[PDB]
């Protein structure tokens, strides 16, 4: 009755679309959905165009543009903002040779927009290329009803206390698995390396893991995966939020925990290299928590500095297999004496480009 | 409209998923769902990962972990808990080469968790192998709406008294058969030997039978089957509960009656062996009740009173084709001089590993 | 309001199809055993996984159920046995899956009170040389979960009879989808459903089975009944065989029974038809006793002589006449051969008892 | 929201009437409501007329008529049926000098209707005038919603089992006390001797007791109490039923237990006269059952099974302090050597005139 | 949704008034007899017409009821007797109409199992010399018809505790109308209600009765409970006295009892009190049995030692302290004299048993 009752998309018919989706087209014709990051640094925008050819590379896609003043990227008279494809994926909605196109964005003068964090991240990731840095990201998120309350939670109230929902199974334990399952498979079909999923501590809260991807491709892939989550959830009338505190107080906020390695760390006795990198990471702490947050640490501080599977934003701790510590070497990695380390500081709404750039600067470029 | 009105999963669209399900993936890509028992010893948990190969046995799969502090399996600062794969099944939700994996769980130091009953059962099952013991379990369960009241029952009250609902047919006799049929088929596809189903005495109450299964297999199989029931139910917005007394008073609680035979018992003249086994089980009643419910024989006490065709919690009686009993020999087993016997004591929420072990201890060791 | 409280109507209906397309290894066979309970009117069922494709009812195992849970308590040994009698293709699962009609037997091998097949079969076998054929017109009514006829205004009545019989239209007949699904399921299963029609009462319908030789009418009508209840379950709709599912001047329900022997079907058999009707005239009370499963109590509520119906007490029979106990149809009196129509059996009759009683009187 | 949703009277505004009730008229305008029993023998009918005078006794009221063919009292084309006042009460709905009139009925030729039982009862009661016989009746009844299900019961189902509802207090114990309380007060005001009320075993079930009344007046007063019950219930959209089994099974039926005493049973040593009457009623069980029911034993046969605190229809019994019997003599009476006896046979829908006559015929006219 | 299924909430409430206002001759008197049933928790009532105005209880007729219809079955001798023991003016009917508190007796003239008044009264008269005064703080909770606390989100919880205690506002306290109506109806009836407040738990409230001399605190509290249920009823809201109307870290329910003798109150002061207290430290186990009507089984649920309550095993005494079993209020300590607080009695206690036990231990040894 109440659940999704005001959500426009949940109330529109979902069956008719298949009639039109079945329509055969000249294989020549290609619909391309260009996706980009808006002025908030948090949200995605998209639009599409018809091509008459199958592109092999993002360089073969035309440069496009949008009204930056309609996306919180105003620039007086000169608000036309340009779209530079950087990465191509198969489209799981249209399936043909139809494609999704991640972009980065440039002002009219050829300079990056404020929210373009990929330009510099790429400079750096090229300059550490020889080190073959690999990143995994654990993206947490919460499903909301249209009124902003977490999906399925009683209106004007709370479901039972945490305990039964983590990795839960059952109608009273986890909600909207359908979307999670759809999204997992859509990401796979699109060529994004999602390595798994789980249900989180808060009911309506989930996680998917992406990686491991090399260098800057973790940013393109996570951004596209976010796009896909929002877009799939839209069809259901459900809002997916990346906000780190989608509900105040005792309930679990949201991280984007980031797993890192270089070729040396992955090699035999890389443990010493890891332990070195964590030391370096462990103290420049005030500098990273700024580029782990699209508003420079104001979002972080709603979730962080507590005792709910997180990290204190105040100070810094580096433990082994410690969910309480900002940066963490897993037990099996100590045991193996090689592998990777987990940075538990990035917030669910982090920009991955900023995260990897801060990381690489510190552990490869030697600041 | 009240039925399922507040169930989130029942209020979310169900046809969109099929679009995404039919997406074709490159081969190499396998989705594996790991499943384990949590610190309650009753409830299941699960999560997924992507593999780049097709495993051939459980041994080929990666050991994995979870946070036990989030599963009622806290161990201070060392809360990481380990998932060991013990059985693979085909995945009926995702099909193809996708798989479901039953696990057992270990603490950070390599010891079993309190609710891992399989390590100790596996040991005993292995000592008893040559007697080739076979187990079947009749798992009773009940469908609930989101508010915890049994599915389709009138809000704040009761349907008609017992009688019409057992093995029923008709819109006013039995509810949500679609889940039952979907589950029977899913299990069969998964490789679980579901041997039957029926609607039970209580409206919204049902049973599926698993077996016969070789030794430790009954435990892996029944756990995975329970998983499948919860997980299929979930899509409908419906809760499946294995609680033994999901409504109080004169409403049939729930059992997990266990059928047992050894090789001796299945060969001509087995009835002698069956007779002896029943004899031994009669001198250690209390120990079995304690292993026959995962809270030491306390959820056993809200059901096993000595009424509604059942055992008594304090009292051990056996008999030939007798349902007011603990241990029963079926008429057809007696008439054939060979076969299997029925242990009626275990409750719907028993851990099958514990039931098996207790039994094999008494009648093989 | 319509079906708002029917649990099965409120549960999602599209998810099942995802699990139904699940491919299983050839040779796994699901078998659903079906039986009549201690009311003598209602059906029960459950299912088992089999190893093999049975070639005939004898190849299937004997099973059991707890009689105490279906009004068949025999104190301390209530374990009741299920003997397969007929096998049908399963229209719900298809493949090699089957439904299995049974009859039922106590612990000591004697028949339960509601097993009327045993005794009917002895009689029908004795009459086999007369090749008796039976056709049955099974009437029924769809109900909402509250017991009120489906679609009828709550706490009230739709317009008077006239427009609904064999109707077409959203305001003339209800739930044809179940009717059409049943019709085809029955044909797929191997049941000889010869026709259907909408009846005089809105939400009321009829299916005809036959002609079937002997005992097989009984098996087949029972499985068709099971199929009706079972298909209508998935819609959340109750199908009742109650003979007077609403009181007043609203059409009750019959299971009119058409009957012929070898002699009656050959030219000049009309003589033998009249012989048979005459033997049935002389023992009216024993048939009305056989013609509902409480011995003449349920038919009384229908048989008022007013609504296309015969008298409770008084036996009558005439050509072309729907006010009579036993009617000889126009076409058959004209043709000099065919069958007679027995209009006495109520919609909740056991066809084994009906067959047996008619065979005893016209063949014995 | 279902309780009373389909009941027309519950869905009509209730405060508007007050506006019109407070309209003053001159004391000499009298509204008289004539009430009678219809051809079912169970239900009441009524209608109103304006008088210009205040009658002093039933003798002073006009004899009236109605169309019996609309009340199941057809008699072909001579269907005009006559209404003779026999009792007047003060009207608790209009107050002032307005009145309710209980009547009995008579066919066009002056002979009584089949459902007029008063006539032959009053013949009898007059011959027993000396014995000064008193009657109390314990009228059980059930409130139903408009769909025929008991008021407040879950639709298509049953509330919790019996036990908590008898003389209960609490929103989840008893329902519609306002009607019970209104009616009790309205009976008193109208001039009926209502001695008490209680909530009964079945939820939605209630009882009021009337008496002790002298002779024939028990009949007139109880029929008028009945009228008032339905007429008051009607306002709330609630149906009040006197059906003896308003729900089949292990749910308590409804009786009209009748307390009886003569001058002689009330004096010292009266108990001796009592045990003699019981014995006389014990010799003719089948006579009474037929007088105890608007048919002749048909509705009793659904209530009276032996269980649920009532006598068997088949055989008779006495005892003391026993609620399983037909005729109960209270303890407090045996102990005091005087009082009355309780006939527990009459069903809730009995016609009281029929109950009284049959009892008097037996215990006074020595039949 | 709130009160949507409560029959009394859905019945028109304005019509009754046009009937109550009807006038009747002055010595027509409606009397409502009130008694405790076989649970020893719940009340029952029924009513009769008198033709006179009673001056005291003894002028009312002894009456009876069917004990087998209220869990007071004694086979075929089930008629149970009502003895009037206290009269109150009737706030629902006004005029000379009355409410009658009774105690109950078997057919043989002996007290029913749930009459604690008879023995309580014996002891009270023996301690009359020492002029004992009692004050009781009765907590209770309002429930919707489904048993969920009134106004709480269906299938869930409101915000944590903090804002509700002594709260003001539509989102802080619920159903103040019932509380005000009860407060006043009690005062009019002759019951010495001395205050009320909204409790920690949302929908939870309290009223205080007393100080009352001796046995009358039991009569008066019982009749106040009656009034609460009966007023609640007209709104279609349930009032429960269950000590833990919701599980976990939501505030249970007490019936804290304040106590004094003449000594303790007249100047002599806290040395009489400190001795009285030390007499209670001796017998905790015995008092927990007197302090709910199943003898420790319901208390165990709110007496956790957590959420401002004492633990059910261990005894404790502190000044101005709220974690203790017995309490000396700072205010009484500061002064020569006063009363002491007993914080162990549970919301569903029988006050007659609370008084008796306190009096045996303290005025009698
Ligand atoms: N050597 C590595 N370097 C970087 N990332 C890795 C490496 N190995 C694994 N990862 C990635 O880290 C992520 C692990 O997330 P998850 O399984 O949720 O870990 P946990 O929940 O134990 O913290 C996965 O995407 C995985 O692919
Ligand atoms: N020899 C045997 N040993 C163990 N289990 C058996 C044996 N034979 C059959 N079983 C299993 O016993 C179970 C019987 O379940 P069910 O038909 O519900 O029995 P009932 O309802 O009569 O107790 C099924 O799992 C069946 O496969
Ligand atoms: N000669 C016959 N002998 C036995 N049964 C017959 C014969 N002819 C027809 N039937 C059966 O009787 C049924 C006739 O029912 P129906 O056509 O509904 O009759 P009506 O038109 O009078 O309702 C058919 O379903 C058919 O199987
Ligand atoms: N002497 C008497 N003769 C006839 N009826 C009496 C006499 N004394 C009292 N009564 C009536 O008996 C009835 C008592 O009924 P009730 O109080 O319900 O008792 P119980 O609890 O035994 O059913 C009242 O109608 C009362 O007026
Ligand atoms: N001397 C006394 N002896 C017994 N009871 C008393 C005495 N003085 C006050 N009381 C009663 O104790 C109750 C106090 O309850 P309350 O005001 O809620 O106290 P608190 O909430 O501070 O514990 C009141 O009914 C009060 O009348």
Numbering used by the authors:
A (entry chain A), D (entry chain J): 3 to 369
B (entry chain E): 3 to 367
C (entry chain D): 4 to 367
E (entry chain I): 4 to 368
From the paper:
Glutamine synthetase (GS) plays a crucial role in nitrogen metabolism by catalyzing the ATP-dependent condensation of glutamate with ammonia to produce glutamine, ADP, and inorganic phosphate. Drosophila melanogaster GS (DmGS) has two forms, namely, isoform I (DmGS1) and isoform II (DmGS2). The cytoplasmic DmGS2 is the most abundant form in adult flies, comprising 90% of total GS activity. The three-dimensional structure of eukaryotic GS has revealed a decamer consisting of two stacked pentamers.
